[PDB]
Design an enzyme around this catalytic site. Structure first.
Site, PDB file in Angstrom:
ATOM      1  CD  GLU A  66      34.606  84.490  83.462  1.00 13.91           C
ATOM      2  OE1 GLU A  66      35.615  84.940  82.924  1.00 13.91           O
ATOM      3  OE2 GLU A  66      33.499  85.038  83.411  1.00 13.91           O
ATOM      4  CG  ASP A  86      38.846  85.857  82.234  1.00 18.70           C
ATOM      5  OD1 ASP A  86      38.228  85.297  81.349  1.00 18.70           O
ATOM      6  OD2 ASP A  86      38.354  86.836  82.779  1.00 18.70           O
ATOM      7  CB  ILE A  88      37.449  85.584  76.522  1.00 16.55           C
ATOM      8  CG1 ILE A  88      37.770  84.478  75.471  1.00 16.55           C
ATOM      9  CG2 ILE A  88      37.141  86.893  75.793  1.00 16.55           C
ATOM     10  CD1 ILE A  88      36.630  84.178  74.473  1.00 16.55           C
ATOM     11  CG  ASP A  89      39.483  90.311  81.549  1.00 10.14           C
ATOM     12  OD1 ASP A  89      38.644  89.939  82.344  1.00 10.14           O
ATOM     13  OD2 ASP A  89      39.974  91.422  81.649  1.00 10.14           O
ATOM     14  CB  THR A  91      32.912  87.570  77.430  1.00  7.38           C
ATOM     15  OG1 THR A  91      34.006  86.890  78.083  1.00  7.38           O
ATOM     16  CG2 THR A  91      32.016  86.554  76.688  1.00  7.38           C
ATOM     17  CG  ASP A 216      37.808  89.372  85.856  1.00  6.93           C
ATOM     18  OD1 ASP A 216      37.651  88.706  84.823  1.00  6.93           O
ATOM     19  OD2 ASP A 216      36.920  89.568  86.701  1.00  6.93           O
TER      20      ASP A 216
HETATM   21 CA   LIG Z   1      36.090  85.969  81.042  1.00 14.84          CA
END
Ligand SMILES: [Ca+2]
Ligand SMILES: [Ca+2]
Lengths: 272, 272
Positions: A66, A86, A88-89, A91, A216
């Protein structure tokens, strides 16, 4: 592929350790395309960690991440072994300490997903799946629910990143059509990957959303199909990783019905 | 009241064990007033268990229970020691194995909540609060978030048990107004008591809902105020346990701002 996969699992687990310490400290919260599209220094730190470690042992491979695409890189998928990441899915959840945040690592060979690792940090749950081998959460095999009647199903979705009134009204209008069939209910925990993992465990029957990106859903889609579920486009057609739309359901009966009821929202694809 | 409270925590853990064994089995789902208003045999069994045990130790005490009222008993709150019980908050989640399910006990004397116990079974998280003594989750003190800016809040709400076209349109219309301020997002975990407990932890900033009942919010309300939050009516007036409407917020600036944007749905009170 298996060598890549078990490296992916040790990587997902240590990236998750980083995210879990960071959630309890002060954070630098920054803006990407709007006041509600957020990024923190931990997001960027975890993607750098993940991509550098993977390049070290696999220099030939491609990477779609991302934050890299935010730093001007491109999202066109080719047949080369690609890692779609990703860091951190969730955030917005992370910034708020809302307890659902995941690291998602998806791996594609020949434009087809071969395995997926999704680690939910706060819960300490590692979900994994490799094509033909089954889907697991911390060693326990998963299977989707058996429900085929839409008036008895529990769905998951999200309200999306846009705040443009016309896109928002279209999202809410689609929730209204589904809700009045009637369905038993709609839930939203805040991350597409965790939403899809709850479908894989059988806790929810279906997830749908328009506005997501390939990073994602890459890792969790194969956990759904390997737990026995189905992926589909909201046109009712085959799933397209780059189209920004997905229905991930326990079976083709609910997925088709959801596609029949909802209207497509216009969006830019990830490969445009 | 501390002896009652120690007892009540013992009871909630026992009832919670009953619910957690029961979630792993096949279930006969029954309907109450509509096709989405569900009840299972466990709802009824855990409720009759809770009232029998308390009535043994405390025979002068009054009770308001969800299924007891469904069986013709009356929801009137007097200055007597009253136990306000919901055996399973999250029956639709229970039925699908969607993992947010809670047992809730509120105890009121002189029509004011003195203590509250909410046990989120599948997580193994016991939330408790005693007036003037603070709110805790498994022994850890809880504190609400500091956010006073609505455009940076995370809200929780539910879509409501009604499916009447008009009411669904007001619920969604209210949700569109808040979404477009903008706020950072909206989540729904499926139960009033766990949504309120996430406000107590600081994981979400406010919760609002209309159409809930006094048994859904009695145990969790005291946890939000002892954690530093406020309870208020959707009209901005004082919180009334029987009016079917609540805003549980980290503070009065956010609560009043949410009261300004949303419009009240006419609802039939619990004590009539
Ligand atoms: Ca993310
Ligand atoms: Ca209940």
């Amino acid at each position: 592929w298996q060598e890549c996969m078990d490296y992916a699992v040790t990587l997902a687990r240590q990236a998750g350790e980083v995210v879990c310490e960071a959630i309890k400290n002060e954070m630098n919260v920054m803006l990407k395309s709007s006041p509600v599209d957020l990024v923190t220094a931990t997001d960027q730190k975890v993607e750098k960690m993940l991509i550098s470690s993977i390049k070290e042992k696999y220099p030939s491979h491609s990477f779609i991440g991302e934050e890299s695409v935010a730093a001007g890189e491109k999202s066109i998928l080719t047949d080369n072994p690609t890692w779609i990441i990703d860091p951190i899915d969730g955030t917005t959840n992370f910034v708020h300490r809302f307890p659902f945040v995941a690291v998602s690592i998806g791996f594609a060979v020949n434009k087809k997903i071969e395995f997926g690792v999704v680690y939910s940090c706060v819960e300490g749950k590692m979900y994994t799946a490799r094509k033909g081998k089954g889907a697991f959460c911390n060693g326990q095999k998963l299977q989707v629910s058996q429900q085929e009647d839409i008036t008895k199903s529990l769905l998951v979705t999200e309200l999306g990143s846009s705040r443009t009134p016309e896109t928002v009204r279209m999202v809410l209008s689609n929730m209204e059509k589904l809700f009045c069939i009637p369905v038993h209910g709609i839930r939203s925990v805040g991350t597409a990957a965790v939403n899809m993992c709850l479908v894989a465990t059988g806790g929810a029957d279906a997830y749908y959303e328009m506005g997501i990106h390939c990073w994602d859903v890459a890792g969790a889609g194969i956990i759904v199909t390997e737990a026995g579920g189905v992926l589909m486009d909201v046109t009712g057609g085959p799933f397209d990783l780059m189209s920004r739309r997905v229905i991930a359901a326990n079976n083709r009966i609910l997925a088709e019905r959801i596609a029949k009821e909802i209207q497509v929202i216009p969006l830019q694809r990830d490969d445009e």
